[PDB]
Amino acid sequence: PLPGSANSRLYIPKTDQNWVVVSGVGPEDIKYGPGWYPESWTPEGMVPAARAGQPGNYAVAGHRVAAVFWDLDKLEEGDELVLEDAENFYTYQVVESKVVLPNAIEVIAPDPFNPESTEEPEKAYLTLTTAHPKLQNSHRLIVHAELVDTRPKERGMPDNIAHMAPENEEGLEH
Amino acid sequence: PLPGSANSRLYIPKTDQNWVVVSGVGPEDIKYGPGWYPESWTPEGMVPAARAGQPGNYAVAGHRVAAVFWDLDKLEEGDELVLEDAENFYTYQVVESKVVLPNAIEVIAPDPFNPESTEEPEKAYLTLTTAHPKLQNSHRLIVHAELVDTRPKERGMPDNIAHMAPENEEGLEH
Ligand code: NA
Ligand code: NA
Ligand code: NA
């Protein structure tokens, strides 16, 4: 189909939250909820970002507001984040939460732990970004997580997100 | 800022319509209005698509419904489309309207009149895509338009879209 792109869903057990993640991080894109950065940063230029569950860095921006990323500071090392595509649930575990300046575009590099890399990535990360401190725009709060499990959707939802029901049965795909 | 991406606005005098164009063409992206295809097709793989007003093919999908692209079939050769970014109004003129099968991904090539090209694009195109016929999903109606004017926003809006007011004063940028 034309178009034939897919969206994803993000689930956070710790804060009991979930969203459909749209494509893009412009102001209209993330007005109402989180959005995926379509390109990753490298020193040689922007490159296509990892799709959900895939090697590289799937990065998501959301506003620091009640219905979105206000409570991102509650995440700690070890906490799970689940990303869903059309085929799988991908469970990532938080490996770092930190504060950076707003120009720290390196945090969306394919390997945020090696942003100067000129190699194709091997590990799959998830990064969440939002304004910080609360009610300020001076910094960004960054959560990085690493993939620990890939579950085919045929096996049903992970127990700890199975109560997070959608409003409709429309797919993440056309 | 992180994020620092921009959205665009699309205006169509003929049908007296305008929208904020989001990034991406997934189902969630275009649920409520038109979205920009982030990548253009080439025989060697997907590449980054033209940004608004720029050489290549800025392509937009929208559903064939009342508040979006139902009336795309009313556009005729010569009709104007205006795309707005943070700096300019870009006026394009329709050069072709055609019907294709949904797998005709060549219509989002950087040069849709030379889709097999391996060269960088020279001309700036705008392409609109929607399902066709009305109340069917079997085909796609494609409108291609070519850039004819670049107006800096300091000069205000083109006369024929100056009545198309927004609901708020939020920028297309963060
Ligand atoms: Na969202
Ligand atoms: Na969007
Ligand atoms: Na839209």
Residue A166: which residues within 8 A CB-CB, separation 6 or more? A9
Tell me if A122 is assigned to some domain. yes
Between the alpha carbon of residue A158 and those of residues A58, A84, A152, A170, B48, the distances in Å are 20, 11, 10, 20, 35
Provide, as residue numbers in chain A, all residues whose Cβ is less than 8 Å from the Cβ of B132.
none
Tell me if B17 is assigned to some domain. yes
* Share in percent of chain B as helix, strand, coil (round to 5): 10, 40, 55
Tell me if B67 is assigned to some domain. yes
CA B9 to mean position of chain CA atoms: 9
Elucidation method: X-ray
Contact B5 A29 (CB under 8 A): yes
Tell me if B154 is assigned to some domain. yes
Tell me if B174 is assigned to some domain. no
Q: What is the distance in A from the centroid of ligand 2 to the CA of A6?
A: 11
Tell me if B110 is assigned to some domain. yes
Q: Which DSSP helix (H) or strand (E) runs through A18?
A: strand A17-23
What CATH number is given to the structural domain containing B111? 2.40.260.10
What is the number of structural domains in chain B?
1
Q: Kindly state the DSSP code that residue A52 receives in the 8-state scheme.
A: T
Picking from A174, A135, A172, A158, the residue whose alpha carbon sits closest to that of residue A52 is: A172
The answer to whether residues B18 and B166 touch, using CB atoms and an 8 Å cutoff, is: no
CA B93 to mean position of chain CA atoms: 12
Tell me if B76 is assigned to some domain. yes
Picking from B40, B42, B31, B39, the residue whose alpha carbon sits closest to that of residue B67 is: B31
Distance CA A7, CA B23 (A): 12
Residues in chain B: 174
Look at residue B8 and give its three-state secondary structure.
Answer: strand
Out of A2, A104, A129, closest to residue B140 by CB? A2
Distance CA A91, CA A97 (A): 17
Contact A23 B6 (CB under 8 A): no
CA A68 to mean position of chain CA atoms: 12
Provide, as residue numbers in chain A, all residues whose Cβ is less than 8 Å from the Cβ of B6.
26-27
Between the alpha carbon of residue B162 and those of residues B67, B126, B147, the distances in Å are 20, 21, 19
How many beta carbons lie within 10 A of that of residue A113, not counting itself? 13
Q: If you search the block for the tokens 């206000």, which residue do you land on?
A: A70
Residue B66: which residues within 8 A CB-CB, separation 6 or more? none
The answer to whether residues A34 and B92 touch, using CB atoms and an 8 Å cutoff, is: no
Distance CA B59, CA B139 (A): 17
Contact A61 B3 (CB under 8 A): yes
* Share in percent of chain A as helix, strand, coil (round to 5): 10, 40, 50
Range of the domain at B72: 8-161
